[PDB]
From a paper:
PAF is a small (∼6.2 kDa, 55 residues) lysine-rich protein (13 × Lys, pI ≃ 9) and a potent agent against Aspergillus species and dermatophytes. The NMR structure is a twisted β-barrel composed of five antiparallel β-strands and stabilized by three disulfide bridges. Lys30, Phe31, Lys34, Lys35 and Lys38 (loop 3) belong to a conserved region of PAF that is important for antifungal activity. Despite the varying size and conformational flexibility, sclx4, sclx6 and sclx8 bound similarly the Pro29-Lys30-Phe31 motif in loop 3.
In contrast, PAF–sclx4 mixtures were crystallized readily from solutions containing PEG and sodium acetate. Sclx4, locked in the cone conformation, encapsulates the side chain of a single lysine (Lys30), as observed previously in different protein-clx4 complexes. Depending on the ligand size/conformation, the noncovalent contacts varied in their type and multiplicity. The PAF–sclx4 complex [Fig. 2(a)] was similar to cytochrome c–sclx4, involving a salt bridge and CH—π/cation—π bonds with the encapsulated lysine. Hydrogen bonds to the backbone amide NHs of Lys30, Phe31 and Asp32 were evident and the aromatic ring of Phe31 was in van der Waals contact with an sclx4 methylene bridge. Considering symmetry mates [Fig. 4(a)], sclx4 formed substantial interfaces (>150 Å2) with three proteins. Interestingly, a salt bridge was formed with the Nα of Ala1. Salt bridges also occurred with Lys2, Lys17, Lys22 and Lys35, emphasizing a substantial charge–charge component to complexation. In total, the protein–sclx4 interfaces buried ∼660 Å2 of protein. In the crystal structure, all of these residues occurred in the vicinity of sclx4.
Residue numbers in the entry: 1 to 55
């Protein structure tokens, strides 16, 4: 499943709702182009390949 969520800057985490609707918090990468740069920025998660991209 491909989901869109919101990331937090200080924890560099992506918050999204999983298959069941549960809030799920996962770590964005540190790499600049995939890290969270501002609270409530968009992030996406693909639950099959674990592609996590935070803005
Ligand atoms: O995110 S962490 O705080 O847990 C962390 C800190 C450091 C680390 O070396 C790593 C994680 C491992 C690591 C993870 C990733 S990731 O796969 O994307 O999550 C990437 C890197 C890495 O070392 C590569 C990397 C990227 C960047 S950046 O894209 O320009 O932000 C910078 C660095 C990298 O090694 C240098 C770096 C900076 C810093 S700093 O404190 O932010 O200056 C701490 C650590 C560093 O290795 C020290």
């Amino acid at each position: 499943a491909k989901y869109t969520g919101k990331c937090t800057k200080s924890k560099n985490e992506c918050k999204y709702k999983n298959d069941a609707g549960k809030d799920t918090f996962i770590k964005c990468p540190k790499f600049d182009n995939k890290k969270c740069t501002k609270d409530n920025n968009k992030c996406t998660v693909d639950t099959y390949n674990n592609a996590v991209d935070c803005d």
